[PDB]
From a paper:
The mono-ubiquitination of the histone protein H2B (H2Bub1) is a highly conserved histone post-translational modification that plays critical roles in many fundamental processes. In the budding yeast, the H2Bub1 reaction is catalyzed by the E3 enzyme Bre1 together with the E2 enzyme Rad6. In addition to the RING domain, Bre1 contains a N-terminal Rad6-binding domain (RBD) that also makes important contributions to the H2Bub1 catalysis. We found that the interaction stimulates Rad6’s enzymatic activity by allosterically increasing its active site accessibility and likely contribute to the H2Bub1 catalysis through additional mechanisms.
We screened through several fungal species and were able to crystallize the Kluyveromyces lactis Rad6 (KlRad6) in complex with the Kluyveromyces lactis Bre1 (KlBre1) N-terminal fragment 1-206 or 1-184 (crystal forms 1 and 2, respectively). The structures were refined to resolutions of 3.2 and 3.05 Å. The structures indicate that two KlBre1 N-terminal polypeptides dimerize to form an elongated RBD that binds to one KlRad6 molecule. Our structure indicates that KlRad6 interacts with the N-terminal region of KlBre1 RBD polypeptide 1 and N- and C-terminal regions of KlBre1 RBD polypeptide 2, which come together to form a single Rad6-binding site at one end of the RBD. It interacts with the back side of KlRad6 opposite from its active site, composed of strands β1–β3, the C-terminus of α4 and neighboring loops. The interface buries 2000 Å2 of surface area and contains hydrophobic, salt bridge and hydrogen bonding interactions. When the three KlRad6 molecules not mediating extensive crystal packing interactions in our structures are compared, large structural differences are observed for residues 90–98 and 115–121 surrounding KlRad6’s active site. The 90–98 region can be resolved in the electron density map in crystal form 1 but is mostly disordered in KlRad6 molecule 2 in crystal form 2, the equivalent Cα atoms in the 115–121 region are located as far as 5.2 Å apart. The temperature factors of these regions are also elevated in this structure, but less significantly. Together, these data indicate an increased mobility of regions 90–98 and 115–121 in KlRad6 in the KlBre1 RBD–Rad6 complex, suggesting that KlBre1 RBD allosterically increase the mobility of these regions.
Author numbering:
A (entry chain A): 2 to 157
B (entry chain C): 12 to 170
C (entry chain D): 16 to 182
Write the structure that this text describes.
């Protein structure tokens, strides 16, 4: 009933009524401060048809504080660190309270479309995106097939 | 077959999308691989026809050698021509002839009483390249036809 | 069967079997690239050695055709010399090696061809055939990529799951 927990429940109604294309998310049946989220890779990106699962961590300062958001799937992306945490400007310093679950995920989903250089989380990924696009795509195509094996039990 | 387009995706929908996504990735390699099988048939066939086709060129050169060793002046050249006649292996023979075709032609022209044209070593070099680039051109054109025909029947199946 | 023939058939297969089918084709495809690279190399090396053996007979023809007695024989040797098709040469050489050998040994002549003029023609042809090869090879790469890109779109067009997710 606290201001954070009430605002989050609205985001769940948002995801339930009009879920953005290629995205789903839901809180834990026993804890609304943790959400299981999953982003499907958009078309014409090397992350195409990839089913990548995420984990969202909130505190009582939401929506005034950006949630701590990190990936659970193996990811090869210049912006995604090795621990799952993401170098997304919206999350770090561009936080605007008008962002809900739906927008946070499509923003990350859109990092697959056109990534952001000079934010080197995976130097391997950042450099290979500039020097050997084939080897970059080969490594991403691997993270896409490995994403498909989960069976998405976090969605029921 | 499960949807509900307005309702958020379900575990049953993502598995049904992961399965279909597997097929799309699968069919990409299946198609890419089956065309590479098609190319290997194209390559293997050309390998056998090319090897088979040289038997006319090789045997006719052995004929010219035999008629010339008897009237050769140099003993180094008589030995080399006897090596040609006594090799009895077309793959080895063909390499002996192609590597020494300049020398071989000169020996036949000198002994049989013809004027060895000057600039004749470059004449053979440019003749073998012209013939090779012609065969390589035609092969890549058949590779295009056979690949086009391969993919076209696949697209035909979809419609 | 053991393989999903159609996309409609994929519902019946488990993930583990699908992964197995995916990796088998990936491997067969990656192995055939290695094989085709090796074979294509061997085809040209074999082609070079066969063109070297035959061209030496064309050389012997050119040095003697100028001094031939019969018009029946000059026509036959000019056809031999001017056939830019190695497959045709091999049949001309193999079918008529008796006549060709007799003509080189008997009708022995002089050096009066344009020794420098034909070298120049062959230099322009070699350079031309080199450009045409490179162009025809890119046409293959662009066609493989083109058809593969087209076939890939059909799978997403006919995918009910993509239609559900991104409607």
């Amino acid at each position: 009933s606290t201001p954070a927990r009430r605002r989050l429940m609205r985001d769940f109604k948002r995801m339930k009524e009009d879920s953005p294309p290629g995205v789903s998310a839901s809180p834990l049946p026993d804890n609304v401060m943790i959400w299981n989220a999953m982003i499907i890779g958009p078309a014409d990106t090397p992350y195409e048809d990839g089913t990548f699962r995420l984990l969202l961590e909130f505190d009582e300062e939401y929506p005034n504080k950006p949630p701590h958001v990190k990936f659970l799937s193996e990811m090869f992306h210049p912006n995604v660190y090795a621990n799952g945490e993401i170098c997304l400007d919206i999350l770090q310093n561009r936080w605007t309270p008008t962002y809900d679950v739906a927008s946070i995920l499509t923003s990350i989903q859109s990092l697959f479309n056109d990534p952001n250089p000079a934010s080197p989380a995976n130097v391997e990924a950042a450099t290979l995106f500039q020097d050997h696009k084939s080897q970059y795509v080969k490594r991403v195509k691997e993270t896409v097939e490995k994403s498909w094996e989960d069976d998405m039990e976090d969605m029921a | 077959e499960l949807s509900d387009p307005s309702e958020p995706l379900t575990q049953k929908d993502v598995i049904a999308f992961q399965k279909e996504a597997l097929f799309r990735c699968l069919n990409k390699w299946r198609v890419k691989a089956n065309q590479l099988v098609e190319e290997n048939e194209v390559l293997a066939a050309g390998l056998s026809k090319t090897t088979e086709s040289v038997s006319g060129c090789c045997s006719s050169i052995v004929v010219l050698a035999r008629s010339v060793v008897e009237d050769c002046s140099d003993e180094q050249d008589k030995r080399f021509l006897q090596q040609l006649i006594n090799t009895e292996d077309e793959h080895t023979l063909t390499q002996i002839i192609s590597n020494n075709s300049a020398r071989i032609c000169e020996l036949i022209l000198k002994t049989s009483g013809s004027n060895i044209s000057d600039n004749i070593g470059r004449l053979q070099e440019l003749e073998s390249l012209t013939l090779t680039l012609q065969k390589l051109l035609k092969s890549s054109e058949n590779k295009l036809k056979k690949a086009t025909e391969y993919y076209e029947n696949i697209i035909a199946q979809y419609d």
